[PDB]
Every structure is written in structure tokens, then in C-alpha cells.
């Protein structure tokens, strides 16, 4: 039978992205189901082995998947990962694209902390979106994990903490729907952009869609133009209309950070923690699903 790493039987394809396809796998040693990421060794610029190095640097952190195997086999670079549960996009769709305020805030607390942890390891993620957060399995079903480090990169030197330099004239990196305003302006990404994207993810959960989503265009180059224009023409206060002011406060805070500024991860958590209490919610791990 076909087994990557001589050990993981290949199952059905479960996803595809710019940096490889994802398949179900089964560890013949334990029967443990796993996720197998494959990248063609002929790829323009190989990326999976670098992604694997990032995962290894983050191991042990709360909500970081464990990497089981990395190697080259046949026409593929291989990365075998612990299998997690459904993504937040999967669960959002399962829940008919409605999340309660309580679920949004339960998620927001952990997602801010996941992003802070990555930053604490000197990296920015650069692709914050609902598909890239997965709940844990079984007992760990209460824990939000972050995945997909294919666009991640160091933003400061590990020893000196010298921040990467500012620059403009960059092409869009990440996803158009969730990218920060400064990313659309061609500015180098930094810590603030991961958190701004999260702010759009949270308002997406509240609304079911974002106002720049589903725009009619022609080229994908002009697709980005219509998205950038709508995102810039929609004030944060209009975006967040009908929802607690904390969501606009969060987004305004992120937009006001300077390029190399350390975000106040505690302030942002307390905004939505204070709201959680005002609402009368308890942190009892009861999500909409």
C-alpha cells in the first residue's frame, strides 16, 4: 500500500492551497489519523521545508499543532502533522454562518493569545483568516489552534530584537478579504497587521460576510482593486454598525499602531473580556456548536 514516510497511509484530499495539498493520513503504527501536506519538489520556490522549521520553533506553545514527520519522497516534499478538528470557517458554515456574541468573544480571547505567542517567537503570520484556526480534537475541542505558516516570517532579530525595515511598493500578501488596509497600500507587514486581520475575522463572524466580499470584477488584478477600494471606503464605524463598540475600538487600535510598535495584547483581550462580563456570559466552553 502507498505510505508516505513508510508509515502514514495516504487518504483522501481534504484541502488545497498555494503552498501544497492536504490529505488525510493514517499512522499505521498507532492508527492515529494525521494530516499530510504535500508540495511538489518542482515548485517555483520551495516553501514547505521552511514552514516545517517554523512549526518546530513553535512546538510546545498552546494551540500549536505538533509536526510528526518531514522528508522528501518521490515528487513531493512531505510534512505530516497532528490532525486537528474543524476549522472555524467549517464551524461557521456548520452553524449556518451565524455565531453568537458569546462564541465570538470566546474565540477572540484565544485568537489574540495565539497571535501574541507567534509574535513572542519573533514571527508574524501574515495569513490570519478563519480557515487557519482549527479546534482541537476530543478533549482539546475547547482549544483554538493556529495553522498555516507558509507566509509567516521573522519580523525581528531573535537576539537584538531589531525590527525588519519599513518599505512600501509591495504586492498583496495574504488573502484579499482579510488583509489589512496597510497591506493593500503596499506596506510591509508587521505585528499590527495580524491583529487588524483578526479584527476583520471577528466582524465577519458577527455579520456573516464582509462588505467587500463577493464583488463583481474581471481580472484578479482588478478584483483586488475593487476590494481595496471598498475596504478603504467603509469606515470602521460603518463596518461595525449594529455591534458593540468594542469591535470598532479594537480595529481602530490596530490601525493606529505604528509599523514597529508592540501591540498591547492585554488591552485588546480586556476590551472583549469586559464586554463578556457586561453580557453576563460565563467562560464555560459552550460554543454555538
Amino acid at each position: 500500500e502507498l505510505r508516505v514516510g513508510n508509515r502514514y497511509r495516504l487518504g483522501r484530499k481534504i484541502g488545497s492551497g498555494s503552498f501544497g495539498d492536504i490529505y488525510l493520513g493514517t499512522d499505521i503504527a498507532a492508527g492515529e489519523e494525521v494530516a499530510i501536506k504535500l508540495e511538489c519538489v518542482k515548485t517555483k520556490h520551495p516553501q514547505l521545508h521552511i514552514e516545517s522549521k517554523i512549526y518546530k520553533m513553535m512546538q510546545g506553545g498552546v494551540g500549536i499543532p505538533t509536526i510528526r514527520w518531514c522528508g522528501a519522497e518521490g515528487d513531493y516534499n512531505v510534512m505530516v502533522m497532528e490532525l486537528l478538528g474543524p476549522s472555524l470557517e467549517d464551524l461557521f458554515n456548520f452553524c449556518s454562518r451565524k455565531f453568537s456574541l458569546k462564541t465570538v468573544l470566546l474565540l477572540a480571547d484565544q485568537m489574540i493569545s495565539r497571535i501574541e505567542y507567534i509574535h513572542s517567537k519573533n514571527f508574524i503570520h501574515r495569513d490570519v483568516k478563519p480557515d487557519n484556526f482549527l479546534m482541537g480534537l476530543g478533549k482539546k475541542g475547547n482549544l483554538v489552534y493556529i495553522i498555516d505558516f507558509g507566509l509567516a516570517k521573522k519580523y525581528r532579530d531573535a537576539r537584538t530584537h531589531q525590527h525588519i525595515p519599513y518599505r512600501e511598493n509591495k504586492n498583496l500578501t495574504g488573502t484579499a478579504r482579510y488583509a489589512s488596509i496597510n497591506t493593500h497600500l503596499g506596506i510591509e507587514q508587521s505585528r499590527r497587521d495580524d491583529l487588524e486581520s483578526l479584527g476583520y475575522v471577528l466582524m465577519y463572524f458577527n455579520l456573516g460576510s464582509l462588505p467587500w466580499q463577493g464583488l463583481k470584477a474581471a481580472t484578479k488584478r482588478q478584483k483586488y482593486e475593487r476590494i481595496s477600494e471598498k475596504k478603504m471606503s467603509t469606515p470602521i464605524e460603518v463596518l461595525c454598525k449594529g455591534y458593540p463598540s468594542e469591535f470598532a475600538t479594537y480595529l481602530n487600535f490596530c490601525r493606529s499602531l505604528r509599523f514597529d510598535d508592540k501591540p498591547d495584547y492585554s488591552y485588546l483581550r480586556q476590551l472583549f473580556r469586559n464586554l463578556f462580563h457586561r453580557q453576563g456570559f460565563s467562560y464555560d466552553y459552550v460554543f454555538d456548536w
Partner: peptide, 7 residues
Amino acid sequence: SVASLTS
């Protein structure tokens, strides 16, 4: 609009 884009 949801594709992962690189630099």
C-alpha cells in the same frame, strides 16, 4: 478573494 497570496 480568499486565495493565499505571496510577495
